[PDB]
Every structure is written in C-alpha cells, then in structure tokens.
C-alpha cells in the first residue's frame, strides 16, 4: 500500500541520517574559503558534517541566503543544505549570472521531482529524464486519459505543496541502502544500478522532500518557496507528463506565461 511504503522510506532515510551523523568525532572544526567575485574574501570556520553553505550565507548577509541557490565546491555545484566535506572553496551562484547552467539544471531537476511527487500523491514512476533547458519543458515519464480538470487539480496540488514550504533533504547514500529503499520498483532499481556503474564507486545520491524520496543526478533547489509560478501543460505518451515553472525574480507577467505554456503544450 502507498501508506506504508512512504513510511518505511522515511524511516530508512532517518536511519541513514542517524548513521551518517554517528560517525563524526564530536564536531570536527574545518576551514572553508570564499573565493568569489563579490566580497573578496572572508573565510568561514564551519564544521564538516553538520554545517552547510546556508550557515555561511547567514554569516554573510540575508541577501546571500535569499539569492544563493548552489555553491561550486572545487568546480562541482553543491546544494544549500549539504555538509561541506573537507576544506575547499565556495562560490555562491544566483539566477542572474554569466553562466547559470548548473543552477538551471538544478531547477529543472527540482521541477521534475516536484511534478513526480505531485503525480504520485494525486492518484508508478520510472525516472527523471535529463531534458536540456532549450527544450523548455521538463518531462517525467509515468507507468500507470486526463482532461483540463485533471491538469487544474495537479496545478492546484503543486501550488499547495509550494506554499507548504518544505526544504530539500539531501544525502550521500551508498547503493545497497538505495536499492533496499526502492526495492518495490524495478525501474528505480535499474536506474540506481546504472548510476552506481557510471561512477567509479557506488555513492548513490538520494534526496527527500518532507515525505517523498526520489533519485536525481545533480544538485536541486533548497526550498520549494523559490518556485513562484508552476503549471502543467499536457500529458504525452509509458505516459509522459509535461510542465513549465518559473521561480522568483523571473516573473512572466501573464502573456509570456501563456506563450510558454502554449509552446510546452506541443
């Protein structure tokens, strides 16, 4: 049943979090530098298994927390809520940058995960296709005909989930626990196996959105409140679900919104 699977997944996620937290030697101080184009350059003496770049943003100013989305750790982008392992560098990124490709991909993955969660809570998923940004329509295949009322209800549920304001709980789980969590789904098992075989080691990145757990590739959006606008275009055929969303600081007024909706409907 769907009432017990989610509970067991949440319990497994909590157990994994406890296991990951019960290994640090009781607060291990470290040092991280902020090599960026703005404010060059303070150094933060945060932790390595409890602190997060969000703490650095808070130490800096509220504007950083309101604008920062990702953080390039030695060239690799990281989420706002993630433990900074070892001593490295941080580069806060926003939506109005020179090359916000990583932030765009993270927003795409977050929108895909949110649409998948909404689909699961409405009424079996398969994965999250990595659709580029030029397509302008993040997809999310589903393995089960809807109408305009169904799309309206889905958009209402998405807006309610956004208003709920739930952070994105990320982790660095291995492959064994990842497979044990999603053991009731063969598609997710195959996806986890492929992700583990792609990289040298296992390390299967997992994320949670309050009560829903999925699998992604890169970073994600910290809080759901950033996704201001959200809509569902149509459903294509394994049934594919389309949609388009825009975060804060990128409002489409209304005409551009309708134009993008019509473009994604194709």
């Amino acid at each position: 049943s769907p009432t017990e699977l989610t509970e067991m997944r949440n319990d497994l996620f909590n157990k994994e979090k406890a296991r990951q937290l019960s290994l640090t030697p009781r607060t291990e101080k470290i040092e991280v530098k902020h090599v960026g184009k703005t404010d060059p350059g303070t150094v933060f003496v945060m932790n390595k298994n409890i602190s997060t770049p969000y703490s650095c943003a808070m130490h800096l100013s509220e504007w950083y927390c309101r604008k920062s989305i990702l953080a390039l750790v030695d060239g690799q982008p990281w989420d706002m809520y993630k433990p900074l392992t070892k001593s490295c560098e941080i580069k806060f990124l926003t939506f109005k940058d020179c090359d916000p490709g990583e932030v765009n991909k993270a927003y795409w993955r977050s929108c895909a995960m949110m649409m998948g969660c909404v689909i699961e809570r409405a009424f079996n998923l398969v994965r999250a296709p990595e659709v580029p940004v030029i397509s302008g329509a993040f997809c999310y295949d589903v393995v089960l005909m809807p109408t305009k009322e169904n799309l309206r209800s889905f958009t209402k549920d998405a807006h309610a989930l956004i208003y709920k304001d739930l952070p994105f709980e990320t982790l660095e789980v291995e492959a064994k626990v990842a497979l044990e969590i999603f053991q009731h789904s063969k598609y997710k098992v195959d996806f986890i196996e492929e992700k583990a075989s792609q990289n040298p080691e296992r390390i299967v990145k997992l994320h949670r959105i309050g009560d829903f757990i999925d699998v992604s590739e890169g970073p994600l959006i910290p809080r759901t409140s950033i996704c201001f606008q959200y809509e569902v275009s149509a459903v294509h055929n394994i049934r594919r679900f389309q949609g388009v969303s825009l975060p804060v600081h990128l409002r489409a007024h209304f005409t551009i919104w309708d134009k993008l909706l019509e473009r994604s409907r194709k």
Binding site: F44, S51, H59
Partner: protein
C-alpha cells in the same frame, strides 16, 4: 642556577620545604578554580597574582563555568626555579579536568560537563619577599600540546575590507 635560587629562597623565607610544595600548589590551584566557579574575587586575589587575574577573569566575565576535579595523574613535579626580589617557581601538572562554560543566556560553547579531559599545565608561582605566599604568576603553553577543543559555534574571519 636552581640550587642558588633554592638557597636564597630558604635564606630569605626562611622556613621552606620543596618536598611538600607540589601538594600545596595543587591545593591553591583547586581553591582558585573553585572560587572562580563561585565568582569570589576577594578569595581569588589572595591566591592569584595581579598579572594573571585579568587574564582569567576578564574573558570569563558575564558567563558562568562549572570546573571539576577528580583523580590527579602522576605526581606534580617541579621543572626549574629562579629568582622587589621575587622568587619564581615553575610547577608541572597533569590531571583530569572538565570545562563547561555557559554563556549569559545559558547555551553551550565549550566542552561537556561530565567528560574529563587530559590537559598539560606549566603553572608559574611567585611570592612576595613580609606578608605574602606562593601565588600563581603565568602559564607556559609549551610543550607542543594539542591546540584546543572544537568550539560548538562557528566563527567568520573577515578579509581586508577596502
């Protein structure tokens, strides 16, 4: 050099014994720490000199502390001795101690309370040479001991602001 200072101290004291000096030094240390716990500057000044009083009372001001003492490892040994006219004595210590400093509004920012820790100490003592006694002077942070404990909170060191 140490024998000359010992002879001078025994002559100007004059009654003095080194064989039973580490015990009195440890007792004075424990009494000073208990007074710090209770925050009794009157009883503290009678045990610590004026040079070390602000070094341990100014930084710990506006914040309580729960220091403890239990079981001293190894006997307190003396390192060196040397010598207006003030006699300096360096005493070595190595006992299990605790550190639970609480801020104004409670909270915590240092080690735990029920977790003893091994910390080396090279306390230096001094005495007035008509109405004085052996009182602490300074603390030699040598030898190359571990730095400190990890603070619970996080600190942000700013760079050069133009």
């Amino acid at each position: 050099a140490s024998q000359v200072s010992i002879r001078r101290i025994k002559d100007y004291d004059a009654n003095f014994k080194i064989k039973d000096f580490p015990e009195k030094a440890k007792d004075i240390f424990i009494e000073a720490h208990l007074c710090l716990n209770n925050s009794d500057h009157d009883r503290l000044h009678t045990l610590v000199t004026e040079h070390c009083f602000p070094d341990m009372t100014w930084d710990i001001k506006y914040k309580t502390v729960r220091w403890s003492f239990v079981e001293s490892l190894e006997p307190s040994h003396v390192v060196q001795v040397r010598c207006n006219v003030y006699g300096q004595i360096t005493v070595r210590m190595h006992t299990r101690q605790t550190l639970a400093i609480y801020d104004r509004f409670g909270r915590l920012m240092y080690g735990q309370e029920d977790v003893p820790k091994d910390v080396l100490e090279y306390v230096v003592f001094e005495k007035q040479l008509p109405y004085g006694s052996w009182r602490m002077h300074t603390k030699i942070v040598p030898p190359w001991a571990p730095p400190k404990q990890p603070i619970l909170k996080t600190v942000m060191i700013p760079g050069p602001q133009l």
